[PDB]
Design a protein around this ligand. Structure first.
Ligand SMILES: NC(=O)c1ccc[n+]([C@@H]2O[C@H](COP(=O)([O-])OP(=O)(O)OC[C@H]3O[C@@H](n4cnc5c(N)ncnc54)[C@H](O)[C@@H]3O)[C@@H](O)[C@H]2O)c1
Ligand SMILES: NC(=O)c1ccc[n+]([C@@H]2O[C@H](COP(=O)([O-])OP(=O)(O)OC[C@H]3O[C@@H](n4cnc5c(N)ncnc54)[C@H](O)[C@@H]3O)[C@@H](O)[C@H]2O)c1
Ligand SMILES: NC(=O)c1ccc[n+]([C@@H]2O[C@H](COP(=O)([O-])OP(=O)(O)OC[C@H]3O[C@@H](n4cnc5c(N)ncnc54)[C@H](O)[C@@H]3O)[C@@H](O)[C@H]2O)c1
Ligand SMILES: NC(=O)c1ccc[n+]([C@@H]2O[C@H](COP(=O)([O-])OP(=O)(O)OC[C@H]3O[C@@H](n4cnc5c(N)ncnc54)[C@H](O)[C@@H]3O)[C@@H](O)[C@H]2O)c1
Ligand SMILES: Nc1ncnc2[nH]cnc12
Ligand SMILES: Nc1ncnc2[nH]cnc12
Ligand SMILES: [K+]
Ligand SMILES: [K+]
Ligand SMILES: [K+]
Ligand SMILES: [K+]
Lengths: 462, 462, 462, 462
């Protein structure tokens, strides 16, 4: 009962967090099916996992699934605003080291990751990594390279983090093999698209309580997150316009019934105020960045936006919006946590009744997790069942224990095989009460598949 | 001008067809852009293309683009009901050999393909093949192998035809290389999905004029065609249920807001009447097959359907529905072309006032093309720009002229490169008036792409 | 068998029309329930009904219901393009006088109405009137006032016709009592709104085969027809803008997720070209008029529309669009019946390849009936069950047989009582397989209604 | 300033509340337009308003508009869970008597109303009443008749309160005239419908964070609230079924694309368990009551619901659900405020891991206000502009000062005139940036209206 190896906002929130974990378990059949399937086998016995992912109720169910399969863990959040304090409390109260609270400073964010890496002031004997966005992976490679000599693999959650892993692999700087969890269909579709459909409008309502119907939105990007975000707004009755640099994604937006526009005249972002389509931006009530890119809602765009427009970002990092420009030039009036009016009158105080402001959500950080609770349990079930399978695979592979010759042929970034992707999906469908049909032998022969799958070639896009 | 090398329903429909071709050209900017870009170069000069694809207005613009780039062609439809007679007439009146009419018998269908293959009773000097579904490809391999010796390639339109090509490649029986046109994103995720969204409800309305809002539909399959078909019906207000054998596609259906059901109890299709979920099928007003598989709307399902339900197929071939069972056992009352009441009372004549019938559309053949006009020009623009690019590529490669050892290195089924897919998409977006944004050099570096694209890795699923 | 008292396009279409009538009966449970309920009673024995309403399959079922209840009728269509020739043929072949074909001239339209009014060159002994739009009503009042001395009532179908009846009543020129069928909920909602949702996109697809998704629409008006029309387009993925003069209707459009715009700068229609919002009109691909008003798509709007935009009208009369201006100034190229390219280059012939044209559907007449088949049977069931009830009521009232004192207290325009409106709706719900719940006595007492209804006060708006 | 005449949860929330009021003012152009138009005239100078309506931010803007026009007020909430504590704090900190907090007991709820009625232990000098649901109106009639002698009128917000007023009028017990604010179009067809569309899914997400897409809902009722509620869930991807006793509303549900079902076999609610459609209720994941009626989600329905279904009510009063049965028989586990697991195992404690529970939101009280923030400011703008106009009208009429014979002529429940309804709507449309078109004199004559409106007859249903 003398557990002290944690730091959370308020340990007394634990009972509430535990009640929400018990509900979440009932919403996560793929993940809880893995718990039941592998509990006796203990496939993660001896695993010591450094985890860095949004400390939500859903991540709590992931953590306790890893522990139930035999692992020890040390946990932090991968964003300063995404922790649910009741989830962090419930995990700490169960005797699991977690360093996470909603509303960390940047210094506290780094300190939290460091508290997972170090145990009693010395490097923990970690041997597995679970990451979301690549921050823990980067810190280990830059600051604790000796620890990577003992680590069998990294399982990376998100599009931005995979990009960072691939840059390291191309540069010969990745030191351990990784699984790209993002690119399972039961992750990328379910989480990146459907999760944002549920949680974007949720976060905007909680932050502002604004009517969305009848108002004008601009969604920057139309990848998986942009697709789900645009739907989140369109289904509420917003008039949604979409920006894109990828003409295939822009084609999908047109065919999906959106008008495709650019913030810049003729799409040319030459850096001048003259290039901004001021007429377009002057009619926009809400802008949402979804790109994983840098400065896609720039200073000149922010200057041109309609008065009282809402500005938010649902991509991984806040630099999608030039919030640095806003910090330098405009006065911030906090409405409530994660909601700020940015007064474009200047930086020297503000007029509480000034009409020329923007509303920035979550200080430009991931808005669904910052102003609401991120994706719902039944969606995160897919992503996190993938994470568990990937942790099992890399931990059983034992890369750190292999001779150097075996290591060279295994230093890669891989995806989960389609058969496992299908098995996760089947458990998700059953959670809805859906009934999948079984092919007859003649039908399986006719289309050239096994009755048990996989049902599509690896090239299939769904 | 003394041209007689054609067979169509009614040559006097040519002027109407030509008016619709001129409209369609204005709806097909990618295809007409290729005409403008390549007309001076004449990249298909010397090409002699056997074409087998639905003889619609959209196919007319494809044909005339190939001719405009230097090709000569001989053309037939790939389905007995999909020709638009005014399109066939306009092509024949332009001096282009075409053998196609709406409402062919099976014998006439085979004769029409044979009239493209033979000219003046002897093999035409063909050197290229454009196919949709693989029927012409199969006839050439089985009956005209000497002609394949001089053919440089096949460009195949559709999922079913690609499967047939891959079976041949794996068995060592494919004799010329092929391009899988289906799997461009501007084909598969445009034509297969959005095309069916436009044209399924269109065909049902033309065939029956039934209100769809408030009625119950069952869509068999949730691949690209099943996704577009379900949306076609849901957007009209149908209550849509979806069946699937692929749990990933079933998961998408659930997350897209559909109830996932099986015609069989617990999904087990064991051939007994007892396996049919009679309560489910007894409530269905419309069943649509979308699978490319065999007997997915089987005899026992047809016996169990609600009285007066509509039965149709939008997959390539009619054997998705057991129409043979219906021909053997039940009396067919033609309402009008491509609309039959199937009287479940028996086969010995019918009672015009019997209440126990099903309405079968297009005798189970592709319903969008059989009962309406298939996909609209602005969607087919994508598929057919891909076709032209693929014809240019295989014709310029000149496989038939290669030595045996070089043929061996090039005998493959390939897809178009992503850069070309993006260039097609860009023209389509411009056709909507969409404006694609250009990355700055810093943004392109940040995400690791060229400013000119491609913007996604080949693994990206959109 | 010597029946000659009719004029239709082609009597040989009768068997096809009869097959479609038999299907339509199965889609019209309220109307066929009235047939079964009242057949023995013959409540319309002795009725001699002049009917003027779109001679569609649905009107055929109405006609034969009146006849089955004892009436004699003489029928014409209320629009030159709305007849379905197979329906007119089936009615004529059954021995019922009908004068109607698709594609009448204005002179033929008037001649057809006159052939119902006259029998053997003399006024028919008509005693009831069923009208849609008020043309027959107007002709009787202006040209055959003596016939109105024998007529017990008029049952008027549509919003425009009711307006005309109310003007006559206010002016003391209406000569017989009328029932406003339009304002039953089972008419106005079902027909005016839902019918247009089904049939507007249907007609545009049949006329043009244009992709609608991703394109820009302007719907003029947001009453019942404008609401249904906007939904017909939005559900196809159009980007729909709405114009209105009624701020309450405009508020609904905003809340329904549409941008509300005016063709005129600041909404001020001063008659000058300068007042046109040329930037707005230059981006519109489709304009649909829904108002029942005059010149809502005027000459200056037509001049400013985007090249190749589609122009159509779904209100009752063609004068919603200034087609007279187009006839005077621009060359018309017929694509096919009810589809014309209007070449804005001038009136002296046209260039078949000119890019500066508009596509006008149905020459500006009701587009759903002109280019498709109007509303579906299951929707028209509501409107036409109301018509039958209203004919029974007015015929049984016997206004023409009353003393002058009784006539004065009965010269009114009335609606059907709510209890009958509910009974029609119940039969419609049952046709969908819907199950209405029965209030318990305690619940009925709690909300202050009878268990049998009516369930709402007459002020309720639904 | 020494003000103590209030009771709120926490006065230190005032500054947050004031920030949200200032935002809400920018979202409420009709209400703020009334403030600007009437501030100089002071039409409510001398008004002393007892107000009983949900103490939200939106109600704060209403209160301060009344005060800005000259009124003094004493305020309470009309529901124990609907107060936003920061709104109550901001109003109290402005020196306005308010007695309201989120989470009142029933005794506290009654005490709060009593603190508005009494000032310093004696009747306040009230002369106007603003009510939502009729509780304050009932207390005044039953317990404070002498106070009603000096009250000029009641302005009643909601359907349930209007029903109570009409019952009193019919029984001869209503003592002062009333305005039915509910039945303005800018109230009923804005607040009742669109408000629930925004706020129902909002409350469910905040209370449970459940994914809604792909799950089964049953909405009891399809009036204004039921229509908006069904849309709230359907737009999230729920499979929504609708129950109704009114066949017209049921017909609308069918035509809007919903399956219409009854909890009872054949719709017969005879009080036996055998009458429950157990198969139907066993598949429902969420039930929402919308009726204003009693016991529409009864004890037998609650016993039959699928395990872990969510149960909630968005009608005015909690007796739509038999929560009394649940309090008597089943154990309640509080998850967090306004979220309880109802364990169907029995009442003698509960098992935290029991799978057989229902999730009840807001203890069966109005869920949008109990678990979220009710309707958004831009929707409440309409309702509350109507409230202000109604207060001005009844206060200026001065009923309490009239002689008995004149009171008799004015004792009524009336609605606001259409012209005012349109003027409210126009301000709302301008708030979206919408542009209403002005009729030309010829067009106004053609349809029989004034250029200034009203544009529709009083019978028009929108
Ligand atoms: N908040 C969440 O819950 C959540 C969930 C999943 C992923 N993410 C993050 O969201 C981001 C996007 O992820 P994704 O999976 O959608 O990636 P994606 O690659 O599928 O899509 C990003 C899109 O942005 C477009 N884009 C890039 N630069 C642009 C610019 N300047 N203007 C317009 N469009 C531009 C690209 O063309 C691409 O289609 C990543 O940072 C990812 O880590 C967040
Ligand atoms: N009519 C058209 O215009 C049109 C357009 C494109 C393609 N097609 C044809 O439609 C068919 C489908 O093409 P696609 O691109 O959608 O292929 P696809 O592979 O994307 O989808 C077919 C789906 O059917 C499912 N399926 C197979 N057997 C099943 C069964 N017994 N029950 C339920 N689901 C089952 C598969 O799991 C798969 O997801 C092919 O024949 C293709 O050639 C028609
Ligand atoms: N084609 C069909 O099947 C069909 C069906 C029903 C009715 N109708 C006809 O459609 C028309 C409309 O009927 P409705 O029932 O919708 O009537 P409605 O009164 O409910 O709606 C007409 C709307 O037009 C608006 N309007 C008038 N002038 C306008 C202008 N200049 N600009 C913009 N908006 C303007 C009005 O404000 C009103 O809301 C009538 O002519 C009716 O007879 C046609
Ligand atoms: N929560 C909110 O923000 C909010 C907003 C407006 C009104 N309300 C309240 O919601 C309730 C409904 O208001 P409304 O304006 O929609 O009223 P309404 O009269 O328009 O609709 C109620 C509907 O319930 C139906 N109904 C009655 N008993 C039924 C039963 N046993 N089963 C099924 N259907 C049944 C009626 O037929 C009717 O159509 C009222 O109590 C009102 O005060 C709440
Ligand atoms: N609820 C959630 N938990 C963890 N990671 C997430 N990413 C998005 N939503 C999430
Ligand atoms: N199908 C139809 N028949 C008759 N009148 C109509 N009005 C609209 N559609 C109609
Ligand atoms: K969550
Ligand atoms: K077509
Ligand atoms: K029809
Ligand atoms: K609110």
């Amino acid at each position: 009962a003398g557990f002290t190896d944690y730091k959370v906002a308020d340990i007394t929130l634990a009972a509430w967090g535990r009640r929400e974990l018990i509900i979440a378990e009932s919403e996560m059949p793929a993940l809880m099916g893995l718990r039941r399937k592998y509990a006796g086998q203990q496939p993660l016995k001896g695993a010591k996992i450094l985890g860095c992912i949004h400390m939500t109720i859903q991540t709590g169910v992931l953590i306790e699934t890893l522990v139930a399969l035999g692992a020890e863990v040390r946990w932090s959040s991968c964003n300063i605003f995404s922790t649910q304090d009741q989830a962090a409390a419930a995990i700490a109260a169960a005797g699991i080291p977690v360093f996470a609270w909603k509303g960390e400073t940047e210094e506290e964010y780094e300190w939290c990751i460091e508290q997972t890496i170090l145990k009693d002031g010395q490097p923990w004997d970690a041997n597995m990594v679970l990451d979301d966005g690549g921050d823990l992976t980067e810190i280990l490679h830059k600051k604790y390279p000796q620890m990577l000599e003992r680590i069998h693999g990294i399982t990376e959650e998100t599009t931005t983090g995979v990009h960072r892993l691939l840059d390291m692999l191309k540069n010969g700087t990745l030191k351990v093999p990784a699984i790209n969890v993002n690119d399972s269909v039961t992750k990328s579709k379910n989480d990146n698209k459907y999760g944002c459909r549920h949680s974007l409008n949720d976060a905007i309502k909680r932050g502002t309580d604004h009517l969305l119907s009848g108002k004008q939105a601009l969604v920057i990007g139309y990848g998986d997150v942009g697709k789900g975000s645009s739907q989140s707004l369109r289904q509420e009755g917003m008039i949604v316009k979409v920006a894109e640099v990828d003409p295939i994604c822009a084609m999908q937006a047109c065919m999906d019934g959106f008008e495709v526009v650019s913030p810049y005249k003729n799409g040319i972002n030459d850096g001048t105020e003259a290039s901004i389509d001021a007429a377009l931006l002057g009619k926009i009530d809400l802008i949402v960045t979804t790109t994983g890119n840098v400065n896609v809602c720039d200073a000149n765009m922010l200057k041109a936006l309609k008065k009282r427009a809402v500005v938010c970002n649902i991509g991984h990092f806040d630099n999608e919006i030039d919030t640095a420009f806003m910090r330098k030039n405009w006065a911030w009036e906090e409405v409530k946590p994660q909601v700020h009016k940015i007064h474009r009158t200047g930086k020297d105080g503000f007029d509480a009744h000034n009409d020329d402001y923007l509303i920035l959500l979550a200080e430009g950080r991931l808005v669904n997790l910052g102003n609401a609770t991120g994706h719902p349990s039944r969606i995160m079930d897919g992503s996190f069942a993938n994470q568990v399978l990937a942790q099992i695979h890399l931990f059983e592979q034992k890369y750190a224990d292999l001779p150097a010759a075996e290591k060279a042929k295994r230093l890669s970034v891989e995806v989960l095989p389609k058969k496992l992707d299908e098995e996760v999906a089947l458990e998700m469908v059953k959670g809805f009460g859906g009934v999948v049909t079984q092919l007859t032998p003649k039908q399986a022969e006719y289309i050239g598949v096994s009755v048990e799958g996989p049902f599509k070639p690896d090239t299939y896009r769904y």
